[PDB]
Amino acid sequence: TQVEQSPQSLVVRQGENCVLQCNYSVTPDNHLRWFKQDTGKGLVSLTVLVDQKDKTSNGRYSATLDKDAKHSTLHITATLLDDTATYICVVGDRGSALGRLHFGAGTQLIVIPDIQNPDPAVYQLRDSKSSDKSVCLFTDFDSQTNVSQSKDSDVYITDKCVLDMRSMDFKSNSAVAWSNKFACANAFNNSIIPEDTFFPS
Amino acid sequence: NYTFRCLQMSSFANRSWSRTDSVVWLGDLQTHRWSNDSATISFTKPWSQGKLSNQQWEKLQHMFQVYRVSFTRDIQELVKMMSPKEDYPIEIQLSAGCEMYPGNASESFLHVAFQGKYVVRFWGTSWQTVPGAPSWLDLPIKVLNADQGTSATVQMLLNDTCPLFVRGLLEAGKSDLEKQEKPVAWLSSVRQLVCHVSGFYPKPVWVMWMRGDQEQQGTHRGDFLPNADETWYLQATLDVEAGEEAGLACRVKHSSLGGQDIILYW
Amino acid sequence: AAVTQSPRNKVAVTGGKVTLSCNQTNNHNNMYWYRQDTGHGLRLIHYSYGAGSTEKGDIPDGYKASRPSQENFSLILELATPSQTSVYFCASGDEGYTQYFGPGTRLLVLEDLRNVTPPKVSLFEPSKAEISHTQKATLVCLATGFYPDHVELSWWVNGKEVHSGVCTDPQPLKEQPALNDSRYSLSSRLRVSATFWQNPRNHFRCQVQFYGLSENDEWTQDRAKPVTQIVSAEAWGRA
Amino acid sequence: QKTPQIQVYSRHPPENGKPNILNCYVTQFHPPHIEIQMLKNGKKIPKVEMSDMSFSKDWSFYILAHTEFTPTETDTYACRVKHASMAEPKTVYWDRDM
Ligand SMILES: CCCCCCCC(=O)N[C@@H](CO[C@H]1O[C@H](CO)[C@H](O)[C@H](O)[C@H]1O)[C@H](O)[C@H](O)CCCC(=O)/N=C/CCCc1ccccc1
Ligand SMILES: *[C@@H]1O[C@H](CO[C@@H]2O[C@@H](C)[C@@H](O)[C@@H](O)[C@@H]2O)[C@@H](O[C@@H]2O[C@H](CO)[C@@H](O)[C@H](O)[C@H]2NC(C)=O)[C@H](O)[C@H]1NC(C)=O
Ligand SMILES: CCCCCCCCCCCCCCCC(=O)O
Ligand SMILES: *[C@@H]1O[C@H](CO)[C@@H](O)[C@H](O)[C@H]1NC(C)=O
Ligand SMILES: *[C@@H]1O[C@H](CO)[C@@H](O)[C@H](O)[C@H]1NC(C)=O
Ligand code: NA
DSSP: OOOEEEEEEEETTTTEEEEEEEEESSSSHHHHHHHEEOOOOOEOOOOOOOSEEEEETTTTTTEEEEEETTEEEEEEOOOOOGEEEEEEEEEOOSSSSSSSSEEOEEEEEEEEOOOOOOOOEEEEESSSSSSEEEEEEEEEOOTOOOOOOSSSTEEEOOEEEEEETTTTEEEEEEOOOOOOOOOOHHTTSSSSSTTTOOOOO | EEEEEEEEEEEEEEEEEEEEEEEEETTTTTEEEOOOSSSSOOOOOOTTTTOOOOOHHHEEEEEEEEHHHHHHHHHHHHHHHHHTSSSSEEEEEEEEEEESSEEEEEEEEEEEEEEEHHHHETTTTTEEEEEEESSSSHHHHHHHHHHHHHHHHHHIIIIIIIHHHHHHHHHHTTTHHOOOEEEEEEEOOEEEEEEEEEEEEESSOEEEETTTTTETTTEEEOOOOOTTTTTEEEEEEEEOOTTOOTTTTEEEEOTTTTTTTEEEEE | OOOOEOOOOEEEETTEEEEEEOOOOOOOSEEEEEEEOSSSOOEEEESSSTTTEEEEEETTTTOOOOOOSSSSEEEESSOOOOOGGGEEEEEOSSSSSOOEEEOOOEEEESSSOOOOOOOEEEEEEOHHHHHHSSSSEEEEEEEEEEBBSSSSEEETTOEEEEEETTTEOSOOEOTTTTTTOOOOEEEEEEEEEHHHHHHHTTEEEEEEEEOOOOOSSOOOSSOOOOOEEEEEEEEEEEO | BOOOEEEEEESSSOTSSEEEEEEEEEEEEEEOOOEEEETTTTESSSSSSEEOOOOOOSOEEEEEEEEOOOOOSOOOEEEEEEEETTSSSEEEEEOOOO
């Protein structure tokens, strides 16, 4: 294992900066590339550093390389939610196709999204084919709330998840719960939910 | 007026067996030696480091230490790329260095041979094939020229490092290079008469069969053959009829004798 | 310089033949196959320097390569094992260093296909109260009863896919965590303006692309053959 | 492939009973994998020093083999060379008067 990254994982709040480390023993070190990988998806190149002491930029991403040290860092300014991803370090040992790429195992970033205007509520939604089947949508809460798996294993509850209405610059956490055997007032009993949560009807 | 040569030879037997060994000459004196067996380049003289500091030598040898590993891997991959066109065994030779002239004038070279034929040189900014080379080498050359890092380094080595280093060597090795060792001669027959001459340095020498004053035009000078102690051996043979060996001798002129030529009457 | 892979996703049985194909119209001589696995970086399996060439990489065992043409480089697993469950990546390049990577192929090798089952999809229409409290309408989609967990949930509005205002559970949850070969459920939300929901010309559709059995996989059981398929649910707006 | 040229010759003028060095100079061969023995009476001499291998402008290889020897009226000395270019090993003898 000739390419080691640090930290293994890290969590930051939107707007904060972070630094990702890559240290390597590969010989020689023609070039170092930083990839971005969203969960599920594939490898977007962010930059490639080639000189003995090199410095690159690409918008909010900037980076360094010192080849004496065998050390590179990727600095991300003003983290946005989309930066949630795995960031991968690659060292190529030739400047031709004769080279081999040596991959780091990546540094996982999570960015916690800024929720300016929370409006916590638990709404009931009905199935378009069958008015008797339903789900409970806990939504509009801020990042300081946690959602827990249900006590009853016949009730199902999903973990928190942030959506982003791009047209309106508006973000919202949300989570769902449903069951065969139950009602939306009792659905999220087992989470510490805000005092001012709107339960309609 | 001297020539510095780094002669490298590499032999790839299978996919997974090779070796690379190097030797270095300045004129006809060996100054370095690098066996496959050793992790480091060896000095064969006291002055082989030249005028380079210890720190510059370390940096320079490290370049070579990484070159050798990389060179081996590349060749092995270049075989894979051309397969099945060219296969093992593969012999590869570099001849690299710089001939030194007066003033500052120098000429740096780097010739590569494949299976004994000179096919590739480094010229100016890039690798290029030479007249006679196969066409299939165009893909190899295209790949080697893709590596800008190697090109810049090789350019620096040829243009600057070699002549600087050799100007250093020439000052430091002055006494070994200007060395004056004397020839010793002896006679024998088989008639073909043989005048053996040995122990002399430098390489320029004159050997003639003399019947007194007249030069015997039939004198056949052989090749210069090396002795182990960095001195030379030569023999000149004259072809004769028997009973005609009276009043015949071997005259030998050399820089070390200082006017006092060796004369052996038979 | 683009590179495609197919299939994008595959469920296979132990001992079956799996072929992962990679296509490239760049006229790149060279192509490479890696696999990605958590706790390691990408590792090279095989590569090729042109049509007719295949070379062993670092972890070739269990995999045959084939380069029938400049365009195609395939990775063949003759007798798939569970350890070959991974996310494979193909790339290409010319004489330079840059390798141009494909989007990747997920592969799951199961021991046995008996429990493979496609989802039931339900779409849940926005709450009246949400509309009135927020001026926003949140649709919720619910894939349920499916195994294994290889689904791609997608949101479609008037025949075009929508990403803005979507979020999907990062992983599916198990319906019966007590049981070893449990089925899965997965949920997703689409949020739009009440104006947009209140337009009955907007056709909403939640689509799940389940990956399961192929045409040529044997099926012993009574129930419908749980093939790779799309199951979806659908709703229009209303004033 | 090229056939090697072997040349056996002494460093100092020969004299029976006086120590000396005998040189075997193998040249003009390709490939460089070559086996050289120096022989006394047809038996392998133990302490043969070999120089490093090198090549001339024509890319042909050469190598200098040498060892100590006292010559005698009664002892023969030779240089045996095995190489791919030759079916069987070429052996050349030191001729003293040559
Ligand atoms: C003798 C003077 C050469 C000094 C070269 C010094 C540079 C070097 O070591 N290059 C290394 C390593 O390169 C890699 O690392 C360096 C950093 O050290 C840099 O980052 C480079 O950009 C990077 O690639 C590359 O591997 C080269 O390729 C090896 C070149 C082989 C050579 O001399 N070949 C010549 C012709 C062979 C022709 C031939 C091929 C195939 C069949 C029939 C004939
Ligand atoms: C290094 O020098 C070369 C030219 O020198 C010749 O080639 C060397 C390898 C060596 O054999 C010398 O003795 C030779 O005299 C420079 O090459 C030229 O570069 C420019 C581009 O910058 C190009 O237009 C010319 O055509 C090149 N010349 C030739 C003959 O091809 C090279 O730029 C030098 N590089 C450095 C870093 O010093
Ligand atoms: C071979 C490049 C030409 C420049 C030569 C500068 C060499 C200075 C020091 C002697 C190097 C000894 C290493 C030989 C390298 C080799 O060919 O393996
Ligand atoms: C590799 O080549 C050498 C040449 O001497 C030979 O001894 C060895 O057995 C060969 N090995 C293989 C695996 O071919
Ligand atoms: C030559 O050197 C390399 C590394 O030093 C080694 O792996 C290889 O086996 C060596 N080969 C021979 C024939 O000595
Ligand atoms: Na991996």
